[PDB]
């Protein structure tokens, strides 16, 4: 097709810079636009480059366009976790509504969050209505840790997920396990490489 | 300059009739429909240059468009098929080159509606252990038993949606991976400061918006008709 | 002597899908270029058709046109979709673009557009505008076309700079052919009466042709139009209506630059 | 639509037996689609060259057709034109005098 983006996907640690490429054959090439798309959300425009040789910036995003080479780059400086998204390159073949947009398929970026003070624990939580039902919350570990699936299909474990308490400037991983049939929290994470100093109260 | 789409999310059956609507108040002449499938860029289905006409885009087949007025451009699927499962974006514009995109509409077209089921939702309360160890309180919401996977989970504190301190599984897990008819589960956390949870004037709610049948789908089984609905679970803070 | 350089484009749009675009380029009354719909490239019709442009400058200019032709074709088609049902196929578009060169280093550029054979649009200054007598519906395409700043900037550079520079070059390279002198040849005939003086093979186009009783110029002489020959020379006839019997004494005299004073004279 | 004018004329002075070129100049027509034949005694001439169509300052079209021919006392020469602006195809005969 007429618009190619590279790389297809990349994984980057928070604070690292990265660079995304877009190469195209569209003719003519009036302007190039970079969109940002969060998983499930829609299309937020980041910048538009319009000259033969052009440069733009927008906060921590900057971009170059070279119409001779039909090549554009998008630079993200000091990635944050919010940068996890698909970045899409779009070329317009006209300087007006007579034009067609030509969409690349996108580059998928994942930013691994930086956990300042790991404090990995396993807590039990009780149902607000029927207190004899519960779940186990493995939380506060660092991003080095991996959470694997269960032995039983009678037992359920979600994959890790980072939340961010914004006004407190704090991030934490967590995964949740439960079972509907003797089962208990200490025994809920045999199958994962959990840290040596995990807090297990009772 | 704002663009809106409805519905925002839809489950439908093969052979059914689906209408996706777009509304735009910027007094733009031009409107455009696209679909987005993974591994492809957006592709143009239909577009329109003014109230009263419609034009074929690059992939018009299986779709009919309609522009009854300046503000409204709608995309009609007469005989819906699974291959029309996708996210759909509408856009508008004046004579210049910028297009302004709507938020998107997720459409799933199933062969069959016999397995559709709303979720059950439970809210789990923060561990006292956690509170004293970390000074923070973590609620867990759990949705289970639903089919298909078209749910929007959101957190409400005193009647206002909260985003800070929240994360939801990037996608549902299968309660029974062996099966294709399998029902899904989904979890989410809201973590607040202990002192916030400890205040009994804070009302915490976990809400799941589920998409299923319309009031106008035929329903043959004995169970309650699995219509689009909200199921929520709820708790008060405690000292 | 002032020369007009003319790029003449003719485009036919039969329906939603069928289309063809053909062009000829003229310097004065000589053809310099041909660009058939069938051809991916512009053909020189004179050895000097490249002017004083380097090979690189030419390949680059041609490439711009190659893309313009494709661009043009789709833009018309999209514009018809904007007007419909108001305006419909079959549609004819003609363009007439170029410059007129003057003494010193002065010139004047134009870009005129006709729709269904009527002149309606020009590029003037920095923008497209409709001319007096043009239908109002054209205001939508004008507005759309004027949103295209990149086309505006380009056309301005094509008209103000590129044309004059290029045409100056052609005038130098083609001086030999531009200033050629070709001698007329004349002959006589009649119908019922009416005598006909035929003049053919001359270049350039200024020519003097009069029927004469001895040395009195006949008032009745009627010149026809200038008709082209295939070798880029001209053809002209002058007819005189007379009373049968007095065909004697009448002569045809022809003045032309190529003869150098030796006027052609012929008696019946 | 405008109707085409046709004008048949020879390049050099016509002489029976002597090879010459015959011109058919077709002008003043709208729209540009047109068919042109040159005929020796009612029949299509095979080698007929065509100039590129162009148009005048008044926006109307023209084209020059031409072919090699030998005039004789006997043979007739003609230019035949089809154009949508006409019910019937027009034929203009070469008259060496006219
Ligand atoms: C007068 C010239 C003298 C030069 C001497 C050279 C002689 C050599 C002999 C060759 C001659 C044979 C050709 C005969 C054709 C003569 C007709 C003159 C044409 C002049 C117009 C050139 C427009 C250049 C800009 C362009 O290509 N724009 C495109 C593409 O634009 C896009 O690409 C763009 C990028 O491309 C270039 O700029 N390319 C060029 C770059 C540099 C030089 C170029 C030179 C020529 C052509 C292209 C050049 C931008 O990025 C836009 O912003 C972008 O939008 C856009 O789609 C336009 O809309 C195309 C049509 C414009 C004509 C409109 C007529 C109006 C009629 C109204 C209709 C009524 C409606 C009916 C219902
Ligand atoms: C190119 O020249 C124009 C004006 O002069 C020319 O317009 C061309 C279309 C052509 O027909 C030529 O023969 C004619 O002489 C400049 O336009 C002027 O620009 C200023 C602002 O830039 C305006 O205020 C003027 O109104 C406008 N003049 C007219 C008559 O409208 C134009 O800027 C110039 N452009 C370049 C890039 O050289
Ligand atoms: C005039 O030339 C154009 C450009 O080549 C022709 O358009 C192409 O037609 C072919 C069919 O033969 C298609 O495959 C191409 O996609 C067309 N367009 C382009 C931009 O390549 C056009 O057919 C010609 N017109 C006529 C009447 O033959
Ligand atoms: C359009 O017109 C062309 C040329 O007259 C003709 O050959 C073709 O059949 C037509 N096509 C359509 C789709 O009407």
Please say whether the beta carbons of C201 and C233 come within 8 A: yes
Kindly give the distance from the C-alpha atom of residue C13 to the centroid of ligand 4, in angstroms, as a whole number. 10
Q: Is A179 an interface residue toward B (CB < 8 Å)?
A: no
Nearest to A135 by CA among B173, B194, B157, B127: B127
Q: What are the tokens at C164? A: 């004059």
Q: What is the DSSP string of D15-75?
A: -TTS-EEEEEEEEEEBSS--EEEEEETTEE-S--EEPPPEE-TTS-EEEEEEEEE---SS-
What is the C-alpha separation between B48 and B60, in angstroms, rounded? 13
Q: What is the DSSP string of A1-60?
A: --EEEE-SEEEEETT--EEEEEEE--SS--EEEEEEE-TTS--EEEEEE-SSEEEEEETT
H-helix segments, A53-186: none
Three-class DSSP category at B196? helix
β pairing state of D49-50 and D61-69 = antiparallel
Q: What are the tokens at C73? A: 């074709």
CB atoms A30 and C150 under 8 Å: yes
What is the C-alpha separation between C51 and C172, in angstroms, rounded? 8
* b/e D50-89 (16+ beta carbons within 10 angstroms → b): ebbbbbeeebbbbbbbbbebebeeeeebbbbbebeeeeee
- Return the ∠ at Cα C255 (arms to C254 and C256), rounded to 5°: 120
Phi, psi of B8 (to 5 degrees): -90, -15
What is the C-alpha separation between D23 and D7, in angstroms, rounded? 8
Kindly give the distance from the C-alpha atom of residue D4 to the centroid of ligand 3, in angstroms, as a whole number. 29
Three-class DSSP category at C173? helix
H/E element holding C216? Answer: strand C216-217
Nearest to B148 by CA among B125, B171, B127: B171
Q: What are the tokens at A143? A: 């991003």
Annotated binding residues of C, written as ranges, equal 75, 148-151
CB atoms A97 and C147 under 8 Å: yes
| Chain C closest-CA separation from residue B79 CA (Å) | 27
Instruction: Judge if the beta carbon of residue C18 lies within 6 A of ligand 4.
Output: yes
CB atoms B55 and C81 under 8 Å: yes
What is the C-alpha separation between B164 and A176, in angstroms, rounded? 19
CB atoms within 10 A of CB A197: 9
**Residue whose token pair is 């807090």:** A199
What chain A holds in terms of domains, given with CATH numbers, is 1-113 (2.60.40.10), 114-202 (2.60.40.10)
The domain B1-111: what is its CATH number?
Answer: 2.60.40.10
H-helix segments, chain A: none
Among A4, A23, A29, A101, the residue to mutate for chain B (most B Cβ within 10 A): A101
CB atoms A97 and C144 under 8 Å: yes
- Entry resolution (Å): 2.6
Instruction: Judge if the beta carbon of residue C127 lies within 6 A of ligand 2.
Output: no
Please say whether the beta carbons of C226 and C246 come within 8 A: no
Q: What are the tokens at B51? A: 């109230």
Contact residues for A78 (Cβ-Cβ < 8 A; gap 6+):
A15, A16, A17, A60
Please say whether the beta carbons of B140 and A136 come within 8 A: no
Instruction: Please state whether the peptide bond connecting residue C90 to the residue before it is cis, i.e. omega within 30 degrees of 0.
Output: yes
What chain C holds in terms of domains, given with CATH numbers, is 1-179 (3.30.500.10), 180-268 (2.60.40.10)
* Strand runs labelled E in chain B: 3-6, 9-13, 18-24, 30-36, 43-48, 55-56, 64-69, 72-77, 86-93, 100-101, 105-110, 120-125, 136-146, 151-157, 160-162, 166-168, 173-174, 184-193, 203-210, 229-236
Give whole-number Cα distances, B232 to A163, B156, B210, B235, D68, in Å: 21, 10, 11, 11, 94
H-helix segments, B112-228: 128-134, 194-198
User: Which C residues, 179 through 238, put their C-beta within 8 Å of a C-beta on chain A?
Assistant: none
Contact residues for C1 (Cβ-Cβ < 8 A; gap 6+):
none
B30: nearest CA in chain C? Answer: C82
Q: Is B173 an interface residue toward A (CB < 8 Å)?
A: yes
Class for the domain spanning B112-239: mainly beta
Instruction: Judge if the beta carbon of residue C228 lies within 6 A of ligand 2.
Output: no
Q: How far is CA B32 from the centre of its chain?
A: 21
Q: What approach was used to elucidate this structure?
A: X-ray
Question: Partners of C227 in the beta sheet?
Answer: C235
- Length reported for chain D: 98
* CA-closest residue to ligand 1 atom 35: A28
What is the C-alpha separation between C161 and C155, in angstroms, rounded? 10
What is the C-alpha separation between B128 and C242, in angstroms, rounded? 128
CB atoms D23 and C31 under 8 Å: no
Q: How far is CA C255 from the centre of its chain?
A: 25
What is the C-alpha separation between A171 and A114, in angstroms, rounded? 8
Q: What are the tokens at A99? A: 């034009």
What chain D holds in terms of domains, given with CATH numbers, is 1-98 (2.60.40.10)
* Strand runs labelled E in A78-144: 85-92, 101-103, 107-112, 121-127, 134-139
Q: What are the tokens at D42? A: 């009612």
Q: Where are the domains of chain B?
A: 1-111, 112-239
CB atoms A95 and C144 under 8 Å: no
Q: Which chains reach chain B with 3 or more Cβ–Cβ distances below 8 angstroms?
A: A, C
CA dihedral A29, A33, A38, A43 (to 10 degrees): -90
CB atoms A95 and C150 under 8 Å: yes
Among the partner-chain residues B169, B189, B233, the one whose CB lies closest to the CB of A159 is B169
Please say whether the beta carbons of A166 and B165 come within 8 A: yes
Cβ neighbours of B100 in A, within 8 Å: none
Instruction: Judge if the beta carbon of residue C156 lies within 6 A of ligand 2.
Output: yes
- Return the ∠ at Cα C92 (arms to C147 and C6), rounded to 5°: 75
- Report the interhelical angle of C139-146 vs C55-83 (nearest 10°): 140
Give whole-number Cα distances, A95 to A50, C51, C125, D98, in Å: 9, 32, 19, 57
- The pocket around ligand 1, CB under 6 angstroms, is made up of A 28, 30, 94-95; C 7, 9, 23, 25, 33, 35, 42, 64-65, 68, 71-72, 75-76, 79-80, 83, 87, 95, 97-98, 113, 115, 121, 141, 145, 148, 150-151, 154-155, 158, 162-163, 166
Three-class DSSP category at C174? coil
What is the C-alpha separation between A79 and A113, in angstroms, rounded? 10
What is the C-alpha separation between A159 and A39, in angstroms, rounded? 16
Annotated binding residues of C for a D-galactosylceramide, written as ranges, equal 75, 148-151
* CA-closest residue to ligand 4 atom 3: C18
| Chain C closest-CA separation from residue D27 CA (Å) | 10
- Length reported for chain C: 268
Phi, psi of C144 (to 5 degrees): -65, -50
Please say whether the beta carbons of A30 and A87 come within 8 A: no
Please say whether the beta carbons of A156 and A134 come within 8 A: no
Cβ neighbours of C71 in A, within 8 Å: 28, 94
């Amino acid at each position: 097709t007429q618009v190619e983006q590279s790389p297809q996907s990349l994984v980057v640690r928070q604070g690292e810079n990265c660079v995304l490429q877009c190469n195209y054959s569209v003719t003519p090439d009036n302007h190039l636009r970079w969109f940002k798309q969060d998983t499930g959300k829609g299309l937020v425009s980041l910048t538009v480059l319009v000259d033969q040789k052009d440069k733009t910036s927008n906060g921590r995003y900057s971009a170059t366009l070279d119409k001779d080479a039909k090549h554009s780059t998008l630079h993200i400086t000091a990635t944050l976790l919010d940068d996890t998204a698909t970045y899409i390159c779009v070329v317009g073949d006209r300087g007006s509504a007579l034009g067609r947009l030509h969409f690349g398929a996108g580059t998928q970026l994942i930013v691994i969050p930086d956990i300042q003070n790991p404090d990995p624990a396993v807590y039990q939580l009780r149902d607000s209505k029927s207190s004899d039902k519960s779940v186990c919350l493995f939380t506060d570990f660092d991003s080095q840790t991996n959470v694997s699936q269960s032995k039983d299909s009678d037992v359920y474990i979600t994959d890790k997920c980072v939340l961010d308490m914004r006004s407190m400037d704090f991030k934490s991983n967590s995964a949740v396990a439960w079972s509907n049939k003797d089962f208990a929290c200490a025994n809920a994470f045999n199958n994962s490489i959990i840290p040596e100093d995990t807090f297990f109260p009772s | 300059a704002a663009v809106t789409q409805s519905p925002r999310n839809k489950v439908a059956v093969t052979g059914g009739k689906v209408t996706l609507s777009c509304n735009q108040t910027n007094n733009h002449n031009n409107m455009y429909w696209y679909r987005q499938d993974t591994g492809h860029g957006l592709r143009l289905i239909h577009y329109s240059y003014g109230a009263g006409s419609t034009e074929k885009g690059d992939i018009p087949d299986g779709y009919k468009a309609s522009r009854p007025s300046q503000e409204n451009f709608s995309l009609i699927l007469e005989l819906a098929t699974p291959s029309q499962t996708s996210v759909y974006f509408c856009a508008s514009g004046d004579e210049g080159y910028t297009q302004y995109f709507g938020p998107g509409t997720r459409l799933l077209v199933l062969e069959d509606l016999r397995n559709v089921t709303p979720p059950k939702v439970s809210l789990f309360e923060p561990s006292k252990a956690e509170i004293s160890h970390t000074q923070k309180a973590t609620l867990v919401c759990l949705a289970t038993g639903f089919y298909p996977d078209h749910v929007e989970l959101s957190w409400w504190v005193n009647g206002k949606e909260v985003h800070s301190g929240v994360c939801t599984d990037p996608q549902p897990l299968k309660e029974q991976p062996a099966l294709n008819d399998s029902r899904y589960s989904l979890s989410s956390r809201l973590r607040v400061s202990a002192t916030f949870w400890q205040n009994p004037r804070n009302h915490f709610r976990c809400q799941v918006q589920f998409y299923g049948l319309s009031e106008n789908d035929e329903w043959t089984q004995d169970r309650a008709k699995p219509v689009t609905q909200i199921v929520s679970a709820e708790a008060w803070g405690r000292a | 002597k002032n020369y007009t350089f003319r790029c003449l484009q003719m485009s036919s749009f039969a329906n939603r899908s069928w289309s063809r675009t053909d062009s000829v380029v003229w310097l004065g009354d000589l053809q310099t270029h041909r660009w058939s719909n069938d051809s991916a490239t512009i053909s020189f019709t004179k050895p000097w058709s490249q002017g004083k442009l380097s090979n690189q400058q030419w390949e680059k200019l041609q490439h711009m046109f190659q893309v313009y032709r494709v661009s043009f074709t789709r833009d018309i088609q999209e514009l018809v979709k904007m007007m419909s049902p108001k305006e419909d196929y079959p549609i004819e578009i003609q363009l007439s673009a170029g410059c007129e060169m003057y003494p010193g280093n002065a010139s004047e550029s134009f870009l005129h557009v006709a729709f269904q054979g009527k002149y309606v649009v020009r590029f003037w200054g920095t923008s497209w505008q409709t001319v007096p007598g043009a239908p109002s519906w054209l205001d939508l395409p004008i507005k759309v076309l004027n949103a295209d700043q990149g086309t505006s900037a380009t056309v301005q550079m094509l008209l103000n700079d590129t044309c004059p520079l290029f045409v100056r070059g052609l005038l130098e390279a083609g001086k030999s052919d531009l200033e050629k002198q070709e001698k007329p040849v004349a002959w006589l005939s009649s119908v019922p009466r009416q005598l006909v003086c035929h003049v053919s093979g001359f270049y350039p186009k200024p020519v003097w042709v009069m029927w004469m009783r001895g040395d009195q110029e006949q008032q009745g002489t009627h010149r026809g139009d200038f008709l082209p020959n295939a070798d880029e020379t001209w053809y002209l006839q002058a007819t005189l209506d007379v009373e049968a019997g007095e065909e004697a004494g009448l002569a045809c005299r022809v003045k032309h630059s190529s003869l150098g004073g030796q006027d052609i004279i012929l008696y019946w | 639509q405008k109707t085409p004018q046709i004008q048949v004329y020879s390049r050099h002075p016509p002489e029976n037996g002597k090879p010459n070129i015959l011109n058919c100049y077709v002008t003043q027509f709208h729209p540009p689609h047109i068919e042109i034949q040159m005929l020796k005694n009612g029949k299509k001439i095979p080698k007929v060259e065509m100039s590129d169509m162009s148009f005048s300052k008044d926006w109307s079209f023209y084209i020059l057709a031409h072919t090699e021919f030998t005039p004789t006392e006997t043979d007739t020469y003609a230019c035949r034109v089809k154009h949508a602006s006409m019910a019937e195809p027009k034929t203009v005969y070469w008259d060496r005098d006219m």
